[PDB]
């Protein structure tokens, strides 16, 4: 028992981290097979980050201008290309530590582990969620660009995020491994509206099921609700509307606890309307939305 904000083991990803330097800028790259993937703003100076013309900037760069270091050894760059907001630097050596991998675009409300890196060196790992407004609430400093988000299914690493930018609001924005930004964000140092975020309802419900499984049951009540009634409450409290698809993915947790999904919704409804009244759930004094039903199942079952 016990419930933690657990990340996937980061080893498979540490083996792919490299340092990419171009001019005066240094950031992290992801070496998979004979390709190193990094944010394309590695080619910019601070001056041209106000409105960079990336295609023009890249034209002033040759293969020898991208300095790729894997630990202490230099990789020989034999090709470069820009795909959306990422650069793909073809090297002459395949990464001997390339794990089985996929490049996947995650859905908002899904979770992933981030391996925060500086100068191609890993500093830590943490679990986070793609917010409904496509930002992530990460922990990133200058130099962390190129750090990646991922999920792991047994031996396969699904890369889903690459860090690029910190918004003036302190929240983070990035791309999938094809360089497409999640959200409306552009790689320019300009004010950008993140947009109204919402609470991931299905995740709060999944975490309520994890609380019941791990002992915390004070919030369970004698009530039930309907999807319509629940959604009126979710509307008022800026929670994502609950659909039959969400109820279906909560099936395994509903079957594990014997608490019908609509009964758990009525518990969430009372919690939203009355608050915690100074109590806690799984050591938290607020409703946690960064655990999917899949995460709750995985953590409470022990999948490796």
Ligand X SMILES: O=C(Nc1cncc2ccccc12)[C@@H]1CCOc2ccc(Cl)cc21
Regarding 82 and contact with ligand X (CB under 6 A), the answer is: no
Annotated catalytic residue: which of 38, 145, 265, 300?
145
Does residue number 24 form part of the binding site for ligand X (CB under 6 A)? no
Position among 131, 164, 246, 269 found at the interface with ligand X (CB under 6 A): 164
Q: CA angle, 224 as apex, 298 and 243 as ends, to 5°?
A: 55
- Residue 56 has which token pair? 């023009």
Least CB distance to ligand X at residue 167 (A): 8
Helix (H, G, I), strand (E, B) or coil at 107: coil
Partner in contact with 174, chosen from ligand X, a copy of itself, none, beta carbon below 5 to 8 Å by kind: none
Q: Cα–Cα distance between 270 and 246 in angstroms, integer?
A: 20
For residue 176, give Cα distances in angstroms to 82, 231, 288: 14, 31, 25
Which pair of tokens denotes residue 258?
């014997």
> Considering the rule CB under 6 A, would residue 141 count as an interface residue with ligand X?
yes
- Is 159 within 8 Å of 150 (Cβ atoms)? yes
With CB under 6 A as the contact rule, the residue among 28, 37, 41, 287 that binds ligand X is 41
Q: Is-catalytic flag, 160?
A: no
Interface with a copy of itself (CB under 8 A): 1-11, 14-15, 115-119, 121-126, 128, 137-141, 143-144, 166, 170-172, 214-215, 275-276, 278, 280, 283-286, 298-304
Q: Could you confirm whether 145 is annotated as catalytic?
A: yes
Question: Which of 11-19, 94-102, 134-142, 242-250 is the region at the interface with ligand X (rule: CB under 6 A)?
Answer: 134-142
Q: Side by side, which strands form the sheet with 35-39?
A: 73-75, 66-70, 17-22, 25-32, 35-39, 86-91, 77-83
Residues designated catalytic: 41, 145
């Amino acid at each position: 028992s016990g419930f933690r904000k657990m990340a996937f083991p980061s080893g498979k990803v540490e083996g792919c981290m490299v340092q990419v330097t171009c001019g005066t800028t240094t950031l992290n790259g992801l070496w998979l097979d004979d390709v190193v993937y990094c944010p394309r703003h590695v080619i910019c100076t601070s001056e041209d980050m106000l409105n960079p013309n990336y295609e023009d900037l890249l034209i002033r760069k040759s293969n020898h201008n991208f300095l790729v270091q894997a630990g202490n050894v230099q990789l020989r760059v034999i090709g470069h290309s820009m795909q959306n907001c990422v650069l793909k630097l073809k090297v002459d050596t395949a990464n001997p530590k390339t794990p089985k991998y996929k490049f996947v675009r995650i859905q908002p409300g899904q979770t992933f582990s981030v391996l925060a890196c500086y100068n191609g060196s890993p500093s830590g790992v943490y679990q986070c969620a793609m917010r409904p407004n496509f930002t992530i609430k990460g922990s990133f400093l200058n130099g962390s660009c190129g750090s990646v988000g991922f999920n792991i299914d047994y031996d396969c690493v699904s890369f889903c995020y690459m860090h690029h930018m910190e918004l003036p609001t302190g929240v983070h924005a990035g791309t999938d491994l094809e360089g497409n930004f999640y959200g409306p964000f552009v790689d320019r140092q300009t004010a950008q509206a993140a947009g109204t975020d919402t609470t991931i309802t299905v995740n709060v419900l999944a975490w309520l099921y994890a609380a019941v499984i791990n002992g915390d049951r004070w919030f369970l009540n004698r009530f039930t609700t309907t999807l319509n009634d629940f959604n009126l409450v979710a509307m008022k409290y800026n929670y994502e509307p609950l659909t039959q698809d969400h109820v279906d993915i909560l099936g395994p947790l509903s079957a594990q606890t014997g608490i019908a999904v609509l009964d758990m919704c009525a518990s969430l409804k009372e919690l939203l309307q009355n608050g915690m009244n100074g109590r806690t759930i799984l050591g938290s004094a607020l409703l946690e939305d960064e655990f999917t039903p899949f995460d709750v199942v995985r953590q409470c079952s022990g999948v490796t």
